[PDB]
Design a protein around this ligand. Structure first.
Ligand SMILES: CCCCCCCCCCCCCCCCCC(=O)OC[C@H](COP(=O)([O-])OCC(O)COP(=O)([O-])OC[C@@H](COC(=O)CCCCCCCCCCCCCCCCC)OC(=O)CCCCCCCCCCCCCCCCC)OC(=O)CCCCCCCCCCCCCCCCC
Ligand SMILES: CCCCCCCCCCCCCCCCCC(=O)OC[C@H](COP(=O)([O-])OCC(O)COP(=O)([O-])OC[C@@H](COC(=O)CCCCCCCCCCCCCCCCC)OC(=O)CCCCCCCCCCCCCCCCC)OC(=O)CCCCCCCCCCCCCCCCC
Ligand SMILES: CCCCCCCCCCCCCCCCCC(=O)OC[C@H](COP(=O)([O-])OCC[N+](C)(C)C)OC(=O)CCCCCCCCCCCCCCCCC
Ligand SMILES: CCCCCCCCCCCCCCCCCC(=O)OC[C@H](COP(=O)([O-])OCC[N+](C)(C)C)OC(=O)CCCCCCCCCCCCCCCCC
Ligand SMILES: CCCCCCCCCCCCCCCCCC(=O)OC[C@H](COP(=O)([O-])OCC[N+](C)(C)C)OC(=O)CCCCCCCCCCCCCCCCC
Ligand SMILES: CCCCCCCCCCCCCCCCCC(=O)OC[C@H](COP(=O)(O)OCCN)OC(=O)CCCCCCCCCCCCCCCCC
Ligand SMILES: CCCCCCCCCCCCCCCCCC(=O)OC[C@H](COP(=O)(O)OCCN)OC(=O)CCCCCCCCCCCCCCCCC
Ligand SMILES: CCCCCCCCCCCCCCCCCC(=O)OC[C@H](COP(=O)(O)OCCN)OC(=O)CCCCCCCCCCCCCCCCC
Ligand SMILES: CCCCCCCCCCCCCCCCCC(=O)OC[C@H](COP(=O)(O)OCCN)OC(=O)CCCCCCCCCCCCCCCCC
Ligand SMILES: CCCCCCCCCCCCCCCCCC(=O)OC[C@H](COP(=O)(O)OCCN)OC(=O)CCCCCCCCCCCCCCCCC
Lengths: 98, 114, 316, 101, 83, 347, 168, 70, 98
């Protein structure tokens, strides 16, 4: 904050909803609780200049759990390959996939 | 990156407990007071390992106790129990308070026989 | 079978609305020392059927509306929403078992104002617009008390599920612990449905918005309006006059629940015959200066009363 | 799917009655017939909107009573309702709820 | 003593609705503080088990944690059965 | 307006700006802005005439649009990082909208066309709030997200503001429009040094507020809103013309007055980063500001313009305006250069 | 075709926006914004948000939009540009739909995918409550600061609007 | 007399009884003589889907008891 | 991102362009302003619900409450503009050029 009144007074005005790995009612976790925790604990205390380089591995995993971009590319590839072999008589789906 | 390791289709096979949710919900209270030890070991495994592949052997033990638990009901208290979960199964919400009369018979039967 | 279920709900609703017109004309007649329809069929049992055929073979006006597309949208929306407000009603088993059914009925009920507003535009008459604005201001004003009163009652129930209100009243009617709220809920339902003593629209000598409609289109507004009168009185009985439900004999619930729903619908006809009409500025003051102060105060009381007695209902 | 069919049936039925209502009498052939902004109304709508929004913050009260912080929850619940009553008092005393010119 | 009676008896005659509204709202703010059962509301809310009671690995020095649900150690809901 | 309601509305303008400065959550930052815009419109409509109504409308549309863009940046930032904390944004597209939303609120060029017109259509006291207080909230957010702001975007908005503020001011006779263009010109300096040393952004902001508040206070004392009406001051309050001369010279950056300190320190923090072309171009373009400031000094203090006969009736009454903190503000606007090293208190 | 209900609703969502964005008469513009609102709730409902979806009907459609239509009928005095904009909007929507349905990958500022929205849903849930409802109910236990600022803003809205509309 | 108003009430009363009576009977017909299952929360839905797999026939309302356990 | 986000993200763009190109009526633009908040409401709710960000489930409601309060303030200005020039045309609001 521009003014750190919350830290000076020790009052939690709006820090309870900043991150999704904080305390949630009934201990309900977010889908990416583990990834957010890992990135936060990696980058804690070392400033954002260093964290952009020394915690890049954790951050990419966190962003993969958020938008799932890499996974959808992989599933998309498999679907195309199966579709290509499907319209050539070269593939046979098993009974439990149909 | 790496390759996700998965157990084999023969490492997951086990004798299932094929009884409807009404049967489970009728025996839930007695079930939890008899199979607590194998149950809690499996749950401690899951909340600590955080990986279902690490607690498969504990999982099979949970299944075996449930199968053995229901066989004892199958031997001594079958008609009282079959008449208990039939009333539970009738309500859309599967309410306990609608079947107090049938619960007492099943509760008393297990007390004497087991 | 679900499609059969929908038709088993829609057609009986329309038939009930058809014969409510007869019953209204005869109860009003006997309270006025006369009879009402007793010539068209035995005891006027064919009067509703004659009225329906007559309207649907009478030429409609359809004036030079500014749009001619709102003129056809307004009755579709009114009748379409009126039938939709019945699908979550437990009688005793809902057609659609919603988790937030009580909130669904508020949401759909607040959309019925558009048919009042759109028909005002379509008429193309400047004066007919003024009548539509007064009706709209009445409806939105009195659904402030519907929302707060409903919230106060649900604090003793624990959920927005409509079938949970049946469980809540398994030992005693909610009319007993919450009769002050029931009074202001009952009057708030009259104002919502433009019923006497709150019918300024139909109250000639001051204005209605559906004046340019005749024949079939007029009957569509009429049918929707009366289906809402039955629906709101069914809602009231569920809310404040809970009927005990025996899972083995569900018909027992339906008979008792129907009798209550009829007695509350006849109360609407009873109140029409007994009182004069409110002035526009006077029904607004009845809401913003009398009901709202009490509704807000009772809401505070009902948020705290369960806590200080250790009587908070279960979430599920 | 069930809720989708229910909505489709009700509005489809209403449309049918409307169109056959505008056409059934037109199967008949009748001879062709031939031939100010108000401020108080606006303030009612705006007062309803601000009151309606405050109701949105009160709807989750039944679930809010299930918490383990009833002292905090009951303090804010009575704060919102008290503030809603303060708005009513301000309009009442400032002649907002009047219909006389 | 006489000023208040004159004031109260006048609003009660001219504005009975407002007099009722403030009395009801005033009780909603006061009684919870003085009510002896407000503490049981929190205990009931804390007793409701939405989540699973994850067990604790045994180290040997935990005499207050039961080894089985039916052991006498641990929190008891006896007070609730009698309330 | 009732006096009590006037205090309540003002405290809500302050509360909105304070919420922005004490919040670690983007939602509360957005709420802070919304509470600020809601409270400031009534003080712009207070005189109840068509021009005020038009000014309040042009302000609402501009600030409403800016707030929607800001909230779009927050949501995009939530999708790509899964958090709400008020810090560097984690998506370049979020940064652009966030940087452009704040630029619209500030009034930087080319999102500047409303500042001359809104400031002209509202009273002097409302303009003082608009040009000084309303600039604190957007600058607080820029102070915090500057590590991720696009350099070419922030420096491009800064250069246009300096130019457009300069040329726009030359063709003005209305005092309210002259300050508006003066406000656009000084914004460019604050955002030009932001990537390099945010401390000098605050110093230039603090000095600008003090100087701008002094000018509006002196205009309000004599109820002057046009260049000509200001030229009668020498015949009514001679002292007030000497104070206007000193402040106008200060705002132009002429040493040894206070207004030279920020221009001095900003040029220092940019040459350390091997930025030589930009500070020179910025400093030379600022001579446009000094010109139309000097024009007011010729028609106010350094020459005696024609007077009117009825002026003699004014000599018999005193000044009953409040003129709050005017003696203290005028001294801080002129005699603070020897205390330049005190800027370290802002670090 | 029922597995792509969310995408179908989103397509109707956009078409409504092109409706009132082209700015026909205010009467029709508000009509198009009601359709988009209803479709907007439909999308939110299918993602698990029931309270949020219904809050759109009660507060947005049955609230604000009624005030918009109410104010239009009383202060609005009941072209090529409209048609040109409307046709331009539909064409861009068609091409965006056409490409994302052909190669199932489109890059416009962001990298969008075309597999289907269902592929990102969570695969595990056995709670005895609604996670959405629990969060909203936390407004009273966790959001003390939020309640105060929101309530004060609503109270100031009443004061400010009466000041603006007095006219004297 | 006043009792000549009743016949209209009976018809209106019967029409409000059919929707309630029909839904109760149709549910039992379609759910093998039991009430339709109520699934408001995810846990109840999980059990119902599990019952679908345990029935053999892909129907949630066909209950398998101890006779299905070895 | 995903397929649904494209249309929600493209609906915000349409409303933004609609708000930046006035035709004649002031009421028309306010609708484009309330269309923008509807798209932001849906886009945020999709993100929060999908990620099981429990405590953020209240954020979309706060977005709706403030955006409607702002809309009310917008309509009030429109009314006061119409009571002066007899219509809500933006071309009338051109006194401040000089
Ligand atoms: C270091 C930085 C130093 C720089 C400080 C700059 C301060 C200069 C203030 C301008 C001088 C006052 C003046 O000439 O009167 C103009 C004007 C009165 O002239 P008017 O137009 O004829 O009357 C208006 C109405 O008709 C009202 O008519 P009314 O008859 O109904 O009266 C209402 C009532 C109302 O009385 C009040 O004004 C009190 C209201 C509470 C103020 C906040 C108190 C702070 C403590 C709580 C926190 O009485 C008055 O209005 C008194 C006249 C005003 C003098 C008092 C002004 C005090 C300002 C000093 C505090 C600065 C805080 C920021 C200002 C708020 C920002 C929106 O008063 C103002 O409204 C000026 C507002 C000040 C805005 C600029 C604030 C500076 C921003 C920078 C802050 C520091 C960060 C850097
Ligand atoms: C920390 C220590 C700060 C000390 C502050 C104490 C002075 C503030 C109270 C004085 C006051 O009533 O007006 C202040 C304030 C500003 O009014 P003013 O018109 O500028 O005061 C001059 C009048 O001629 C005033 O003339 P007057 O006849 O109306 O009243 C005579 C006044 C005379 O009191 C004075 O001496 C007024 C001038 C005091 C200095 C004002 C500036 C405050 C200090 C700023 C320090 C800037 C540091 C910059 C350093 C940079 C280099 C390191 O005596 C008092 O009222 C003192 C009452 C004690 C409480 O009035 C208010 O609205 C707030 C009360
Ligand atoms: C069509 C003709 C115009 C219809 C206007 C009325 C709209 C119906 C209301 C939407 C449904 C609803 O409220 O859901 C609540 C209810 C809330 O129920 P629930 O919250 O209790 O959850 C039900 C399931 N459990 C309990 C297990 C979690 O929604 C549902 O029950 C099922 C959701 C189905 C979602 C499909 C919606 C598609 C249709 C939406 C588009 C509407 C277009 C409107 C056109 C513009 C006119 C305004
Ligand atoms: C003042 C004018 C306006 C007032 C409107 C008055 C009309 C509304 C109905 C009031 C009378 C209440 C209904 C009585 C007839 C109901 C018949 C019935 O359901 O069975 C008797 C019902 C049977 O009870 P029950 O079937 O509704 O279940 C009761 C629920 N518990 C057990 C929790 C209390 O009892 C009576 O109403 C006797 C009177
Ligand atoms: C221990 C804690 C206890 C806490 C709770 C204590 C509660 C104590 C009692 C509080 C008062 C009870 C509230 C009653 C409602 C008062 C509303 C009100 O505003 O009254 C004044 C209002 C108007 O008062 P007024 O017009 O005479 O004057 C108001 C004040 N002055 C004089 C300044 C203007 O009365 C009305 O509502 C008018 C009624 C309109 C016509 C309605 C027809 C009635 C037909 C009979 C229906 C019977 C009910 C059916 C219910 C069936 C339900 C299933
Ligand atoms: C036993 C002890 C009980 C407590 C004592 C009783 C309470 C005392 C206050 C009651 C009197 C209120 C003052 C009053 O008389 O107001 C009358 C006045 C009516 O004026 P008006 O109707 O316009 O005149 C028409 C004439 N032709 O009305 C007015 O001018 C202003 C009235 C404003 C009313 C605001 C209503 C909102 C508050 C609702 C209550 C909610 C609870 C408030 C929070 C309480 C916190 C504890
Ligand atoms: C600690 C947490 C709670 C904190 C709550 C604090 C906020 C309270 C919010 C209340 C809602 C806002 C209402 C405020 C307006 C009060 C009424 C008013 O505006 O005054 C108008 C009235 C006009 O006077 P006039 O009409 O000329 O003559 C007759 C008047 N009786 O002038 C008057 O004479 C009215 C007199 C003043 C009204 C006082 C109301 C006091 C209410 C408290 C009662 C509590 C009692 C509870 C105990 C009950 C026990 C049975
Ligand atoms: C990316 C693609 C963007 C370009 C798509 C063009 C879509 C607009 C279609 C042209 C159009 O709107 O009509 C012509 C336009 C305004 O319509 P116009 O017929 O001139 O109305 C007044 C006539 N007396 O006439 C004009 O003034 C031209 C406006 C620019 C186009
Ligand atoms: C349509 C033609 C087009 O593709 O223009 C894209 C242009 C440049 O974007 P670019 O990412 O470089 O293009 C991808 C090429 N592989 O970029 C554009 O012209 C797109 C114009 C977008 C205007 C943005 C207005 C502010 C709103 C930002 C929110 C995000 C909206 C964009 C993402 C959704 C896609 C519509
Ligand atoms: C006439 C003077 C009074 C004035 C009129 C009063 C209002 C009208 C009466 C209230 C509305 C009730 C309308 C329905 C009455 C006729 C139907 C009936 O009496 O109940 C029949 C019901 C059907 O039996 P069923 O559901 O098929 O049971 C099969 C189980 N294997 O059998 C049952 O199961 C009942 C238990």
């Amino acid at each position: 904050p521009f003014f750190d009144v919350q830290k000076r007074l020790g009052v939690d005005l709006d820090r309870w909803m900043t991150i999704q790995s904080a305390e949630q009612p009934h201990k309900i976790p977010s889908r990416c609780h583990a990834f957010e925790k890992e990135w936060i604990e990696c980058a804690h205390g070392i400033g954002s200049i260093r964290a952009e380089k020394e915690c890049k591995i954790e951050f990419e995993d966190f962003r993969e759990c958020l938008l799932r971009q890499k996974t959808m590319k992989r599933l998309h590839a498999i679907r195309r390959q199966r579709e290509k072999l499907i319209k050539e008589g070269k593939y046979t789906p098993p009974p439990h996939h149909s | 990156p790496g390759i996700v390791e998965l157990p084999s289709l023969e490492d997951l096979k086990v004798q299932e407990v094929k009884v409807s949710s009404s049967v489970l919900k009728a025996a839930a209270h007695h079930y939890g007071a008899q199979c607590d030890k194998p149950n809690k070991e499996f749950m401690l495994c899951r909340w600590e390992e955080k990986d279902p592949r690490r607690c498969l052997e504990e999982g099979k033990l949970v299944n075996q106790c449930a199968l053995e638990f229901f066989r004892q009901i199958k031997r001594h208290c079958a008609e009282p129990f079959t008449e208990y979960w039939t009333c539970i199964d009738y309500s859309g919400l599967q309410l306990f308070r609608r079947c107090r009369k049938q619960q007492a018979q099943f509760d008393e039967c297990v007390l004497d026989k087991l | 079978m679900f499609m059969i279920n929908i038709l088993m709900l829609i057609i009986p609703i329309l038939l009930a609305v058809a014969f409510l017109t007869l019953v209204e004309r005869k109860v009003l007649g006997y309270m006025q020392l006369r009879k009402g329809p007793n010539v068209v069929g035995p005891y006027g049992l064919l009067q509703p059927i004659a009225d329906a055929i007559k309207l649907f073979i009478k030429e409609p006006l359809r004036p030079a509306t500014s749009s001619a597309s709102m003129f056809i949208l307004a009755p579709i929306m009114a009748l379409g929403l009126a039938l939709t407000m019945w699908i979550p009603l437990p009688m005793p088993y809902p057609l659609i078992n919603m988790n937030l059914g009580v909130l669904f009925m508020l949401a759909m009920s607040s959309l019925a104002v558009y048919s009042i507003l759109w028909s005002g535009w379509a008429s193309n008459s400047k004066y007919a617009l003024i009548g539509a604005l007064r009706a709209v201001a009445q409806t939105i004003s009195y659904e402030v008390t519907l929302a707060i009163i409903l919230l106060s009652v649900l604090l003793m129930s624990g959920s927005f599920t409509l079938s949970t209100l049946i469980t809540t009243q398994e030992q005693m009617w909610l009319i007993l612990p919450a009769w002050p709220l029931a009074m202001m809920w009952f009057i708030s339902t009259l104002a919502e449905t433009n019923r006497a003593p709150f019918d300024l629209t139909e109250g000639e000598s001051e204005l209605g918005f559906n004046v340019e409609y005749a024949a079939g289109p007029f009957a569509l507004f009429f049918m929707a309006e009366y289906a809402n009168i039955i629906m709101m009185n069914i809602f009231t009985a569920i809310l404040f006059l809970g009927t005990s439900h025996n899972p083995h004999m569900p018909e027992l619930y339906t008979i008792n629940f129907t009798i209550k729903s009829l007695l509350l619908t006849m109360s609407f006809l009873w109140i029409r015959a007994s009182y004069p009409r409110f002035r526009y500025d006077q029904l607004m003051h009845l809401l913003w200066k009398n009901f709202l102060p009490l509704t807000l105060a009772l809401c505070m009381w009902h948020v705290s009363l369960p806590i200080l007695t250790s009587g908070i209902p279960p979430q599920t | 799917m069930n809720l989708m069919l229910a909505l489709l049936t009700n509005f489809t039925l209403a449309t049918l009655l409307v169109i056959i209502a505008f056409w059934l009498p037109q199967l008949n052939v009748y001879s062709e017939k031939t031939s100010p902004f108000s401020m108080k109304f606006f303030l009612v709508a705006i007062t309803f909107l601000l009151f309606d929004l405050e109701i949105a913050l009160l709807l989750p009260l039944p679930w809010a009573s299930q918490t383990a912080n009833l002292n905090t929850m009951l303090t804010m619940a009575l704060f919102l309702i008290i503030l809603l009553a303060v708005s009513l008092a301000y309009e009442w005393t400032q002649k907002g709820l009047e219909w006389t010119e | 003593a006489e000023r208040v009676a004159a004031f109260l008896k006048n609003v009660w005659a001219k504005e009975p609705v407002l007099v009722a509204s403030f009395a009801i709202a005033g009780l909603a703010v006061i009684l919870p503080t003085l009510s002896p059962y407000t503490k049981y509301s929190l205990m009931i809310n804390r007793a409701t088990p939405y989540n699973y009671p994850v067990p604790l690995r045994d180290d040997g020095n935990m005499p207050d944690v039961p080894s089985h649900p039916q052991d006498p150690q641990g929190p008891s809901l006896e007070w609730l059965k009698r309330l | 307006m009732n006096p009590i309601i006037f205090i309540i509305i003002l405290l809500t303008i302050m509360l909105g700006t304070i919420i922005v400065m004490i919040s670690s959550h983007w939602l509360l930052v957005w709420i802070g802005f919304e509470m600020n815009m809601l409270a400031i419109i009534p003080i712009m409509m207070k005189n109840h005439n068509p021009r005020a109504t038009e000014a309040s409308t042009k302000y609402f549309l501009t600030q409403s649009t800016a707030s929607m863009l800001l909230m779009m940046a927050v949501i995009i930032n939530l999708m790509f990082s899964g958090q709400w904390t008020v810090m560097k944004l984690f998506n370049p597209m979020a940064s652009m909208l966030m940087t452009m939303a704040l630029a619209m609120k500030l009034g930087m060029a080319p999102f500047h066309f409303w500042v001359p017109e809104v400031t002209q259509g509202i009273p002097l006291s409302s303009g003082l709030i608009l040009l000084t207080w309303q600039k604190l909230a957007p600058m607080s957010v820029l102070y915090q997200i500057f590590p991720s702001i696009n350099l070419n975007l922030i420096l491009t908005l800064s250069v246009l503001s300096i130019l457009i503020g300069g040329w726009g001011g030359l063709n003005q006779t209305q005092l309210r429009k002259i300050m508006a263009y003066s406000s656009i010109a000084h914004m460019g300096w604050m955002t030009a040094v932001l990537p390099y040393n945010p401390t000098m952004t605050l110093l230039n902001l603090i000095i600008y507020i003090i100087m701008t508040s002094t000018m509006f206070t002196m205009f309000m004392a004599n109820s002057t809103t046009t260049t000509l009406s200001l030229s009668h001051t020498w015949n009514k309050t001679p002292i007030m013309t000497v104070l206007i001369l000193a402040t106008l010279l200060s705002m132009g950056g002429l040493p040894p007055l206070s207004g030279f300190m920020p221009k001095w320190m900003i040029i220092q923090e940019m040459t350390k980063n091997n930025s030589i072309i930009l500070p020179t171009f910025m400093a030379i373009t600022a001579l446009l500001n000094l010109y139309f400031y000097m024009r007011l000094t010729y028609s106010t203090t350094l020459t005696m313009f024609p007077s009117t006969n009825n002026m003699k009736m004014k000599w018999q009454f005193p000044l009953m305006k409040k003129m709050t903190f005017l003696p203290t503000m005028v001294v801080l606007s002129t005699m603070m250069l020897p205390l330049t090293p005190m800027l370290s208190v802002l670090e | 075709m029922m597995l792509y209900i969310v995408f179908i609703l989103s397509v109707i969502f956009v078409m409504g926006f092109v409706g009132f964005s082209s700015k026909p008469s205010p009467i029709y513009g508000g009509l198009g914004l009601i359709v988009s609102g209803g479709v907007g709730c439909g999308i939110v409902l299918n993602f698990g948000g029931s309270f949020l979806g219904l809050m759109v009907f009660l507060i947005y459609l049955g609230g604000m939009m009624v005030v918009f239509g109410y104010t239009t009928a009383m202060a609005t005095e009941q072209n090529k540009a409209v048609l040109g904009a409307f046709v331009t909007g539909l064409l861009m929507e068609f091409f965006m739909v056409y490409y994302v349905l052909k190669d199932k990958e489109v890059e416009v500022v962001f990298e969008f995918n075309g597999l289907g929205d269902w592929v990102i849903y969570d695969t595990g849930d056995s709670g005895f409550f609604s996670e959405e409802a629990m969060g909203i109910a936390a407004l009273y236990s966790y959001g003390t600061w939020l309640v105060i600022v929101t309530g004060w803003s609503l109270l100031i809205g009443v004061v400010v609007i009466m000041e603006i509309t007095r006219g004297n | 007399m006043w009792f000549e108003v009743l016949p209209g009430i009976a018809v209106m009363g019967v029409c409000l009884f059919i929707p309630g009576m029909a839904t109760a009977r149709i549910h039992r017909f379609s759910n093998g003589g039991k009430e339709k299952r109520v699934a408001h929360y995810p846990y109840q839905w999980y059990l119902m889907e599990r019952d679908r797999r345990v029935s053999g026939v892909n129907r949630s309302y066909v209950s398998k008891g101890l006779e299905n356990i070895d | 991102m995903s397929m649904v986000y494209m249309n929600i993200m493209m609906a915000f763009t349409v409303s933004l362009v609609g708000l930046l190109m006035y035709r004649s009526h002031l009421m028309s633009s306010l609708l484009c302003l309330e269309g923008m908040m509807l798209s932001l409401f849906v886009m945020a709710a999709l993100t929060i619900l999908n990620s099981h960000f429990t405590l953020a489930s209240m954020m979309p409601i706060i977005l709706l409450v403030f955006a409607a309060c702002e809309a009310a303030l917008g309509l009030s200005l429109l009314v006061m503009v119409s009571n002066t020039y007899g219509t809500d045309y933006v071309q009338n609001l051109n006194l401040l050029q000089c």
